Design a protein around this nucleic acid. Structure first.
Ligand SMILES: [Mg+2]
Ligand SMILES: [Zn+2]
Ligand SMILES: [Zn+2]
Ligand SMILES: [Zn+2]
Length: 1190
DNA sequence: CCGGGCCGAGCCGTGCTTT
DNA sequence: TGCACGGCTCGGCCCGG
């Protein structure tokens, strides 16, 4: 099976997990906790997760064998059949069987990670068609959490319900027309008043869907809005069913393609209507002129990403505008899942709005990505204040020259993986000329002419190197260097021209200017001026002449200076002369044949076409495909704290005040009345909210109370009574409203842990669970002492943005080679022994690289855990850390905010960025996509000691974010489906570049380029992956977004508009400000309409009155009444809006809207705030009065 | 010396909508 | 995508009559 390294890796991981689990089990046995054992079982594959989460017991082996035999979908269907026939045990009525089968099937088809089977499916019930035939059918009730599951999960739930209804021998749902009207109205109102829904079903589609769904999709109410078609038969509510309508909109409708694919694979009949719906939904010119025409015909610009711009979030490029982001096909070391590659220079030169991990909304491949530094690609070309043009391909140069920038001519490159085009099914765009194409042409031409076999990006035999160098008359060392790293070693321009002359290949892409960005008439005028009024110095190299310098005066150059800037030619202006220096004089004069032939404009021809037709040295289009993007959602790395911060899960009520301070209530002697669980000692008879009796140190028993007669029974007594009151007749409850004196409890806790010096200790107003079991106060004291905070289930968590990585360097993460060899790494990614810190090593699937904020916080968490173990439990310390670098080799838990299972990872290094780097398999095993998502990490021992299932809220969305099970091993076969499209090749073949020019589809050449899916099953899914582009440093560049250092809204808008003004391909003046105004106008108009219909509230109480009390004071107390929508909330964005209107070009519609909004704001308060104040000076150059008087 | 003026934390509420 | 903005109270310190 697996080789002798992956097995050792997984064995060591299991050994460490066992080492932690032993201590966690030993500590929990002493009885100071809700349970006497750990409450997080460990799974290993999908069957274990499904068995632990939904059951029924014993299903694991059956799932295993069925998956081995048939597959995934077929195995799910056979499991459903076996459950229905009753192999795993008798359950009860048909409803129980239906619920169990649907839950297990939805868990199997999902791989048992996301909590849709546990949370979304609230209930399954059988209903009768009393309106038509009195026949039976099946219905599904969807709760609130189903909106977080995803379209695939929702659609698969619908399909599983259909299959179970078919196999139960039940009839079809037959809706009345009023049902259709009610559902259409529900969808429309939900979109209008709640959310955008990210999908708009047309009413015809909704009617068709209702007419052709064999099950009833309903549920409880999730929004406080009534409907019109009330009292519909079979419906027990008259409010919005958000879960059901969201399922219907974003499931079967938004993801019909995947649903019909699943139906075809699954062999399910009766869904032909969906298949039909899906199939209905589905002269002498120049080469480059025709290519541009076909590009514009087939692939069309998209504006969806730029339909809205928030104040403070800049737009970096208009849709498919030349001068924006240059598209490059490839995958870097730390990109590929859904992220982009960006040079740090263009991160700096946009006022540092972009930072490592900052999300942005893209146009072509998908929608959204995360930026990552790649120093191997090109940067911006900028125009300075004195008129010079520079190529800022370097980070330090960008820092140096930042203040002199006048305009950004070109914005730089963006590396996008080929697997991102396959996943989103996007037509391939023609590829800009690059070094990774030139090197392939070079080696192919060398082989064709001289019959020498060489290969880029690797090491070749010495005989071939010597033969090629003898033929080409070059240094063999330089040939080896260039073939090894074509992206960093470039020949001098004269050598490039000599290569083009001899071998017959286009010019090196580094020395090609953007010729096709100008018209041939501009080049005609420029050629005339160069021939007439220029002084050029020539040179020689192997009989090849080339220019060395051009000096032409500014007046003689005239208005053709703009042409030199559009070609991206670096020059300088001195004492009236424009000077073009050595490397960039031949880059301009060689294509034009050194003025030997006359450039002449032609119709239906492009500049490169004319150059190729007339010249001997040939060229390729260097910029033809451009991309647009827009900023959104800056990067994040911060701890998790509840809406009011909490340090212990202990209810205090109103005694503690506004901050729920337990210590303040204790020090004032207050007595609080709250609902808690009381425990009673069997031997002596102590009573109170504690798990151990202080008198004797023995475990107590929970007390059960009668809701009607308040009779208390111990757990042993209530066990026989079947948890029902014999004297009364009501089901018991474990909690009742009781009285507590905080002083005694706090003093006992302080004496217990010897922690007396704590200032504040926050609790909760009321426990949300059904048991209302409280937490020990000693844990709260230690958390307060060590400055950490608690979560809803008792764990301490840290939230960060996720980014991918496959290969690392021992110096980027600050780890010595000896430590790495101790961890288990012994070779670099090419087979050589690991001896240096500059070699590239490959990352094992479950190794993570934390940030430094995360390390700083986890140091406090580890200190708290050590204090807990030493003081509360009386056991030796575990971590023993004094610096963040002492946590290396310790295990964490990763958890997405919508799943119920975790995955174990290992710490190996730290970076100085606000992102969480990890393997692509690690992020996919949490059902995450890596284009803006944020997840959590917690120490394994902390979760083991602290997590409990008795602190979980009792509503439906209470089991989300909880590690009910953890996975110990990684299986790439059952992680996700988007990560199966990634690339594992060192370089793209020549066929890919040649096929991009034909505008093919990525499905045609899916076999040419190796992907992850091509390796599934075989042992080398963990073994060898590769990348295309290298990086000097993985965390180089700005680290914090500038958006987080601006306070006012006006300042944000001004900075964003300056940024938009600098960039050439944005066109701020009329679209940026207008689309921005369509973000402040909703705020203004929507706050004036809520001032005239608002509810009032009391300062002391929380009582809300829908109309003001007519005595002016709170009827139930003595406090005063305050508004909920103040007067200053309406007109907070009025000044910025007026500035935007008066400064920039907006259509008269928006200007009139703003003027009338101001007039309406000043007219509603006409007789409550009269203008009794005169003034000295008036007319501050306003715009409203000017518009009125004009 | 004893009484105010003032800051700095905290905790609440709110973000287009034809008849 | 949700966060970003306004307003009310309540002590802890100066600083002055
Ligand atoms: Mg995502
Ligand atoms: Zn006792
Ligand atoms: Zn009773
Ligand atoms: Zn009141």
């Amino acid at each position: 099976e697996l080789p002798k390294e992956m097995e050792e890796y997984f064995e060591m991981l299991q050994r460490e997990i066992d080492k932690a689990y032993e201590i966690a089990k030993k500590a929990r046995a002493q009885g100071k906790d809700p349970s006497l054992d750990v409450e997080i079982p460990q799974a290993t594959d999908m069957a274990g997760r499904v068995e632990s989460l939904v059951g029924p017991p014993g299903v694991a082996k059956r799932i295993r064998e069925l998956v081995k035999e048939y597959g995934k979908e077929i195995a799910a269907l056979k499991i459903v059949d076996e459950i229905i026939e009753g192999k795993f045990g008798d359950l009860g009525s048909r409803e129980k069987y239906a619920e169990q089968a649907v839950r297990t099937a939805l868990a199997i088809l999902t791989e048992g990670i996301v909590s849709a089977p546990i949370e979304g499916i609230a209930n399954v019930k059988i209903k009768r068609n009393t309106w038509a035939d009195n026949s039976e059918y099946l219905a599904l009730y969807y709760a609130g959490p189903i909106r977080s599951s995803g379209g695939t999960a929702q659609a698969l739930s619908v399909l599983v319900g259909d299959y179970v209804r078919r196999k139960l021998g039940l009839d079809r749902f037959k809706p009345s027309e009023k049902h259709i009207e009610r559902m259409v109205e529900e969808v429309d109102l939900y979109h209008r008043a709640v959310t955008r829904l990210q999908y708009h079903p047309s009413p015809e589609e909704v009617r068709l869907a209702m007419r052709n769904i064999p099950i009833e999709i309903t549920g409880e109410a999730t929004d406080d809005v009534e409907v019109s078609h009330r009292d519909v038969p079979g419906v027990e509510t008259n409010q919005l069913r958000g879960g059901a309508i969201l399922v219907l909109a974003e499931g079967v409708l938004q993801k019909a393609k995947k649903l019909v694919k699943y139906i075809d694979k699954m062999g399910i009949e009766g869904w032909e209507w969906l298949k039909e719906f899906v199939e209905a939904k589905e002269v002498d010119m120049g080469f480059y002129y025709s290519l541009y025409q076909k590009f514009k015909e087939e692939i069309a610009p998209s504006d969806k990403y730029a339909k809205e711009v928030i104040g403070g979030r800049p737009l970096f490029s208009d849709p498919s505008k030349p001068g924006g982001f240059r598209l490059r096909y490839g995958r870097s070391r730390a990109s590929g899942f859904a992220t982009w590659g960006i040079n740090p220079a263009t991160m700096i030169l946009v006022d540092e709005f972009l930072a490592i991990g900052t999300q942005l909304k893209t146009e072509r491949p998908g929608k959204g990505a995360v930026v990552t530094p790649v120093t191997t690609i090109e940067g911006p070309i900028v125009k300075l204040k004195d008129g010079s043009v520079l190529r800022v391909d370097d980070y330090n140069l960008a820092l140096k020259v930042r203040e002199d920038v006048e305009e950004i001519l070109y914005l730089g490159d963006a590396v996008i993986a080929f697997g991102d085009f396959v996943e989103n099914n996007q037509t391939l765009l023609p590829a800009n000329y690059c070094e990774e194409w030139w090197i392939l042409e070079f080696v192919k031409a060398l082989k064709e002419i001289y019959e020498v076999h060489l290969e880029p990006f690797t090491e070749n035999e010495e005989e071939s190197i010597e033969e090629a160098s003898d033929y080409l008359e070059i240094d063999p060392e330089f040939l080896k260097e260039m073939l090894r790293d074509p992206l960093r070693v470039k020949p001098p321009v004269e050598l490039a021209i000599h290569f083009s002359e001899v071998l017959g290949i286009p010019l090196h892409p580094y020395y090609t200017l953007y010729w096709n960005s100008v018209e041939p008439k501009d080049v005609e005028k420029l050629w005339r001026l160069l021939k007439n009024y220029a002084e050029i110095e020539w040179s020689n190299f192997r009989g090849i002449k080339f220019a060395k310098k051009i000096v032409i005066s500014q007046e003689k150059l005239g208005d053709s200076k703009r042409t030199l800037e559009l070609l991206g030619l670096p020059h300088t202006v001195r004492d009236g002369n424009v000077i073009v220096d050595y490397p960039w004089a031949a880059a301009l004069l060689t294509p034009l044949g050194n003025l030997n032939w006359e450039f002449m404009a032609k119709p239906l021809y492009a500049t490169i076409d004319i150059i190729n037709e007339n010249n001997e040295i040939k060229l390729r289009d260097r910029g033809i495909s451009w991309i647009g993007a827009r900023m959104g959602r800056p990067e994040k790395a911060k701890e998790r704290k509840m809406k009011p911060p909490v340090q212990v899960l202990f209810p205090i009520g109103l005694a503690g005040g506004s901050s729920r301070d337990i210590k303040k209530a204790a020090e004032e002697g207050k007595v609080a009345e709250v609902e808690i669980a009381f425990f009673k000692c069997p031997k002596c008879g102590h009573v109170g909210p504690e798990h151990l009796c202080p008198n004797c140190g023995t475990r107590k028993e929970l007390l059960w109370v009668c809701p009607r007669c308040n009779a208390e029974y111990p757990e042993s007594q209530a066990e026989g009574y079947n948890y029902t009151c014999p004297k009364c007749n009501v089901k018991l409850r474990p909690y009742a409203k009781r009285k507590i004196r905080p002083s005694e409890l706090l003093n006992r806790a302080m004496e217990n842990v010897k922690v007396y010096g704590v200032d504040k200790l926050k609790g909760v107003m009321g426990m949300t669970s059904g048991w209302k079991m409280p937490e020990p106060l000693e844990k709260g004291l230690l958390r307060a002492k060590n400055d950490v905070y608690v979560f809803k289930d008792g764990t301490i968590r840290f939230d960060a943005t996720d980014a991918p990585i496959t290969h690392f360097r021992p110096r980027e993460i600050g780890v010595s080679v000896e430590k790495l060899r101790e961890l288990g790494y012994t070779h670099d990614f090419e087979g050589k022994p690991l001896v240096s810190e500059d070699q590239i090593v490959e990352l094992k699937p479950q190794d993570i690289i934390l940030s430094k904020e995360a390390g700083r916080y986890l140091l406090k968490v580890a200190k708290f855990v050590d204090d807990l173990l030493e003081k509360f439990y009386g056991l030796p310390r575990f971590y023993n850390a004094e610096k963040m670098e002492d946590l290396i080799g310790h295990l964490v838990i990763g958890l997405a905010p919508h799943t119920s299972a975790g995955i174990v990872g290992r710490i190996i290094g730290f970076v100085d960025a606000l992102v969480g780097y990890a393997h692509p398999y690690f992020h996919a095993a949490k059902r995450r996509n890596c284009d803006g998502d944020e997840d959590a990490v917690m120490l394994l021992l902390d979760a083991l000691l602290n997590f409990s299932r008795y602190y979980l809220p009792e509503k439906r969305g209470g089991k989300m974010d909880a590690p009910l099970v953890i996975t110990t091993r990684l299986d790439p076969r059952e992680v996700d489906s988007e990560v199966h499209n990634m690339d594992i090749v060192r370089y793209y073949p020549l066929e890919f570049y040649e096929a991009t020019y034909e505008l093919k589809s990525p499905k045609e050449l899916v076999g040419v380029i190796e992907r992850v899916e091509d390796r599934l099953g075989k042992p080398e899914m963990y073994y060898g992956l590769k990348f295309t582009h290298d990086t000097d440093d993985i965390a180089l560049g700005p680290k914090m977004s500038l958006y987080k250092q601006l306070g006012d809204m006006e300042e944000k808008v001004r900075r964003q508009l300056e940024v938009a003004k600098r960039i050439r391909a944005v066109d701020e003046h009329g679209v940026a400000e207008k689309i921005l105004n369509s973000h402040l106008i909703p705020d203004l108009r929507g706050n004036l309409r809520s001032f005239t219909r608002q509810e009032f509230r009391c300062v002391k109480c929380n009582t809300k009155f829908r109309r003001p009390p007519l005595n002016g004071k709170c009827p139930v107390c003595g406090g005063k009444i305050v508004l909920t929508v103040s007067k200053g909330a309406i007109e907070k964005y009025l000044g910025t809006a007026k500035m935007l209107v008066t400064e920039y070009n907006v259509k008269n519609y928006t200007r009139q809207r703003i003027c009338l909004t101001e007039r309406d704001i000043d007219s509603l308060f006409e007789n409550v705030f009269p203008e009794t104040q005169l003034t000295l000076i008036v007319n501050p150059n306003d715009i409203c009065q000017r518009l009125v008087m004009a």
